[PDB]
Amino acid sequence: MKKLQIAVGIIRNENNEIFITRRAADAHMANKLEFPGGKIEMGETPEQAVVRELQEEVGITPQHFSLFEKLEYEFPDRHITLWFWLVERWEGEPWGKEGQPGEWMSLVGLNADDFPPANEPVIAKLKRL
Ligand SMILES: Nc1nc2c([nH]c(=O)n2[C@H]2C[C@H](O)[C@@H](COP(=O)(O)OP(=O)(O)OP(=O)(O)O)O2)c(=O)[nH]1
Ligand SMILES: OC[C@H]1O[C@@](CO)(O[C@H]2O[C@H](CO)[C@@H](O)[C@H](O)[C@H]2O)[C@@H](O)[C@@H]1O
Ligand SMILES: [Mn+2]
Ligand SMILES: [Mn+2]
Ligand SMILES: [Mn+2]
């Protein structure tokens, strides 16, 4: 099956809220809440991918970020490796730059059922910060 490397950014403000977008109805993991991110392209690193993806999707440049979690998940029709970067400093103000819904969500109120199942251990670990 398809095998993908995905870089996503956990965008956390000083009020313990995370900037979360909602995936399109015709996408893989349609209508799910998500950390902004996307496919790591040939010739770019995981760190470069999370910067580019957040610039494209929500209009911020992450800086001084860290790898929060790396995990693999087997979906029904594809295998993905997810790189979860914790982003606590950035240039810009995140918004729905690609026309997608985005909003700040309290960390304590996140419901892992709203996200792709691959995010389950990450959402749990975030709540223990
Ligand atoms: N962006 C994102 N994707 C996730 C998360 N959890 C998770 O399992 N995924 C999966 C869903 C997709 O199968 C894949 C993400 O790919 P994507 O749809 O963001 O790819 P992309 O932005 O590069 O796509 P495109 O705009 O180039 O069309 O990883 C998450 O928190 N954020
Ligand atoms: O890989 C993340 C990890 O590396 C450190 C340095 O030890 O940060 C470096 O890499 C980050 C991601 O590219 C950069 O944002 C950062 O500026 C750079 O120092 C750690 O801070 C981080 O845990
Ligand atoms: Mn994208
Ligand atoms: Mn992409
Ligand atoms: Mn994406």
Side-chain angles (χ1 to χ4, degrees):
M1 54 176 42
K2 330 146 83 294
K3 183 181 168 184
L4 295 170
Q5 304 280 316
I6 304 303
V8 313
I10 301 161
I11 301 156
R12 181 165 77 153
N13 69 15
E14 47 182 282
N15 288 358
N16 208 36
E17 294 160 340
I18 312 294
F19 189 84
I20 300 300
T21 54
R22 192 177 290 271
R23 298 182 57 83
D26 53 359
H28 184 249
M29 289 293 109
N31 302 310
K32 292 291 187 185
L33 293 185
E34 58 160 6
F35 306 120
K39 176 182 161 62
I40 299 160
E41 299 171 353
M42 178 86 55
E44 94 188 326
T45 66
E47 301 94 330
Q48 288 171 334
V50 73
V51 166
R52 177 186 51 76
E53 287 288 343
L54 265 51
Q55 286 169 341
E56 293 175 10
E57 289 201 349
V58 304
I60 68 177
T61 295
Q63 53 208 28
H64 195 232
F65 51 93
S66 59
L67 188 59
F68 190 72
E69 178 79 300
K70 176 185 171 186
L71 56 80
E72 296 200 345
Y73 192 84
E74 177 97 354
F75 286 104
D77 71 338
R78 67 196 69 194
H79 185 89
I80 75 167
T81 297
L82 280 151
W83 302 67
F84 296 86
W85 303 93
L86 180 57
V87 176
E88 289 165 318
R89 173 177 283 288
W90 59 88
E91 194 277 348
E93 187 71 47
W95 66 293
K97 173 172 180 182
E98 292 181 346
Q100 79 278 38
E103 56 184 10
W104 291 98
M105 308 192 169
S106 71
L107 183 41
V108 300
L110 294 177
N111 183 343
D113 292 332
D114 292 337
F115 292 78
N119 295 25
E120 290 264 347
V122 170
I123 284 151
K125 174 185 180 180
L126 275 170
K127 289 189 188 182
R128 290 184 60 70
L129 290 184

